[PDB]
């Protein structure tokens, strides 16, 4: 018989992930999301009350289940291993959730009012990169001209939703580390 | 060493050191040391760090502004992007430090931009129009123009990350629907 409330909301979130991923936050409306979800706009607005909250719920559903552990501490301040773990977790997440790559990239490069609320669901843990790189540089293992340029370089490649069509994930992780460890 | 051989040594040294640390991370002192010349001799030939930087772009950048790749390729965005990527990857392979420095300036805009622009970044910026025309014509498929510009920028320019496989692998990632 009838769909459950949980199923309909899930359908709407799948739709919103898809549509937000295609057209960005600004380029997407609740009307197109409802249409994609095959639900009445009224029902979609009853459950989520607007695209802002729907966007938040997208990051919550398809971002990280939990804040990630500190990779440097987890790897006992072995910077190469910390970075391998960091890169493995994130490239794997983006492989499974390409839209989060696109959306997180946009929020990283252009700070919006939404940042503070969505941060725990992806960007907060993604920001561990800086300390990993500084540690590796400090330990004489990573070599790069600028920390911020290296952060932007990795952010751009790791979050790109179609990276798997250019390069395997495990290879991407290896190649990123190699580029840093080359003296 | 002749005047010309000495200038050559200074430019090679400048390319190297700038390539390692970027503009602000390098000094004329350490350039002149790498070149095995006296600092005043570096100044005689190049009038300082900023002009030496300009001269590095002049020597190891593009000789001329590149032609509009879309026009040249009858608005075939796949052929336009192939030609763009080929000229740029070939240039970067010969002088990889220029990729590093162009990346530095692209990601973090400085007061140096307008002087160095036509030696690399100016022609490099055709990327946006090429991708947008490909998207308009149904032959490129991507979610964010800006992310895609930055993704390609990162692959092409950023140092130390099979060239033949490269151009076609980039294009293949875009032509996929």
Structure characterization notes:
Chain B: It comes from Bacillus cereus. Chain B: Keywords: DNA-binding. Chain B: Pfam families: TetR_C_29 (PF17938), TetR_N (PF00440). Chain B: This is Hemolysin II regulatory protein. Two copies of one chain form a homodimer. By secondary structure, the first copy, chain A, is an all-alpha fold. The first copy, chain A, folds into two domains: 50 residues, Arc Repressor Mutant, subunit A (Orthogonal Bundle); 133 residues, Tetracycline Repressor, domain 2 (Orthogonal Bundle), CATH 1.10.357. In chain A, α1 packs across α7 and α6 runs antiparallel to α10. The longest helix of chain A has 19 residues. At the A-B interface, α7, α11, α12 and α13 of A face α1, α7, α11 and α12 of B.
CATH superfamily of the largest domain in chain A: Tetracycline Repressor, domain 2
CATH architecture of the largest domain in chain A: Orthogonal Bundle
Give the helix level of chain A as a range of percent.
55-70%
Shape designation of chain A: elongated
- Share in β-strands of chain A: under 5%
Domain HTH tetR-type (chain A): 6-66
GO molecular function, one term (chain A): DNA binding
Keywords (chain A): DNA-binding
DNA-binding region (chain A): 29-48
